[PDB]
Amino acid sequence: PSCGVTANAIMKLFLDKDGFSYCFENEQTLSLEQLQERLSCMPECKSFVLRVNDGALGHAYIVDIPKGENSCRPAFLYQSDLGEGVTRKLRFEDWMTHKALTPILLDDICNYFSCMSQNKTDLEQIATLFDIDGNVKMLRKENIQYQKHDNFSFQLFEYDTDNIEKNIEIIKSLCSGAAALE
Amino acid sequence: PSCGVTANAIMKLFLDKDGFSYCFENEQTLSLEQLQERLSCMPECKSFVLRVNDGALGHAYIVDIPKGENSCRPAFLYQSDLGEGVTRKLRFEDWMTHKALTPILLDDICNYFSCMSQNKTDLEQIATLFDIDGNVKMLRKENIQYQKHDNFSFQLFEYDTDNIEKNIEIIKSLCSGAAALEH
């Protein structure tokens, strides 16, 4: 599956419940400026999931912001990659059994959004966040797609830890049977 | 999960795509009479998934109708069951790795709908369709909840085989990384 497909499916795991089904194309989007305003007012006692549509990098991914303190607020990054953009091909299983397990600082990925929105990023910043080995040599600057405005689009939702737990239980219960299905 | 949660998740696997997300509570529903009309004119060149809310049996489940001719048209039945009612406890994994991979006749499950809607319980019929072993002794006829009308509610959708394939790949991928999604 593509990075966008993986991202959409993760959103559904966090958000789907009786009476609401997440559908990427139908949900409300935020600009970077609007996002920055929401993140500045985020309470410590709520958890959020952020879907990132990264048009420069060529890639969609998820930032999970658990409940936490606003000083050095942690986050987790979830992604897969077909390897057609700046970053290399990356299987979800591989990302999620290695680098995804270590928290990052929300400020660091937000600094990336700010820099890349102005074409002011650098490969070391990109590799540190997105490459499984932090290896700058695996990036292809020649595959960047910068456009003066609107490089990024975002979707930001509050989530409940009970709901992602339940949805993961559901998909686990289907996995073996589904594979058999044709 | 409950039978209904399993059913709804299976509908999402068949149907979800860019610009469409299945949501059980908001979908259109068919009566049995409506479904019987639709089946009479169902295109042979298309595949369909049918979500069944079976009030009398007290159970929900999926009937997969692939492309095929309307004479003895094949179908597949997918289900789980917590075992509180007529039929016994059944894990989706167990059903799907045993009885589910053998096709059934669409006409046989349709005959069942017709019989149950008229309160003509046939325990052998129910075991043959729904029990992993086909064992009538495992059923509890006492737990049938026949009502005078509106026993059944259905949802019927066309599906594309490319989409179910893509969604199964996604679910297997997600399961492989699931430990990292919770903190």
Is B149 an annotated catalytic residue?
no
* CA geometry: angle B12, B15, B17, nearest 5 deg: 100
Torsion angle (degrees, nearest 10) of CA A5, A6, A11, A17:
80
* Residues A64, A75 contacting (CB under 8 angstroms): yes
By the 10 Å C-beta count (0-12 exposed, 13-18 middle, 19+ buried), A166 is classed as middle
Q: How far is CA A48 from CA A75, A106, A152, B98, B165, in A?
A: 10, 12, 18, 41, 30
Q: Which of A6, A10, A13, A21 to mutate to test the interface with B (most CBs of B within 10 A)?
A: A21
Is A149 an annotated catalytic residue?
no
Catalytic residue among A36, A79, A98, A155: A79
Per domain, the residue ranges of chain B are 1-160
Strand pairing partners for B17?
B20
Phi first, then psi: give them for residue B93, nearest 5 degrees.
Answer: -55, -45
Tell me whether residues A180 and B22 touch, CB distance under 8 A: no
d(CA B64, CA A180): 14
Sign of CA dihedral A78, A84, A88, A93: positive
The number of beta carbons lying within 10 Å of the beta carbon of residue A49 is: 24
Residue type, A58: G
Tokens 């998740």 identify what position? Answer: B9
The number of beta carbons lying within 10 Å of the beta carbon of residue B165 is: 13
Q: How far is CA B37 from CA B34, B40, B76, B110, in A?
A: 5, 5, 20, 12
Measured in whole angstroms, the distance separating CA B41 from the mean position of its chain's CA atoms is: 20
Strand pairing partners for B59?
B54
* Residues A81, A88 contacting (CB under 8 angstroms): yes
Three-state SS string across chain A, please? CCHHHHHHHHHHHHHCECCECCCHHHCCCECHHHHHHHHHCCCCCCEEEEEEEECCCCEEEEEEECCCCCCCCEEEEECCECCCCCCCCECHHHHHHCHHHCCEEHHHHHHHHHHHHCCCCCHHHHHHHHCCCCCHHHCCHHHCCCCCCCCEEEEEEEECHHHHHHHHHHHHHHHHHHHHCC
A59-65, strands of its sheet edge to edge: A104-105, A74-78, A59-65, A47-54, A152-159
Specify the length of chain B in residues: 183
Q: Say whether B171 sits in a helix, a strand or coil.
A: helix
Which two structure tokens, joined as six digits, stand for A79? 């992604």
Q: What is residue B88's DSSP assignment? A: P
- Which residue in chain B has the smallest CA separation from A91? B173
d(CA B26, CA B24): 6
Q: Say whether B178 sits in a helix, a strand or coil.
A: helix
Q: How far is CA A28 from CA A113, A154, A167, in A?
A: 19, 9, 22
Indicate which technique resolved this structure.
Answer: X-ray
* CA geometry: angle A35, A124, A71, nearest 5 deg: 45
Which two structure tokens, joined as six digits, stand for A91? 């299987």
d(CA B27, CA B30): 10
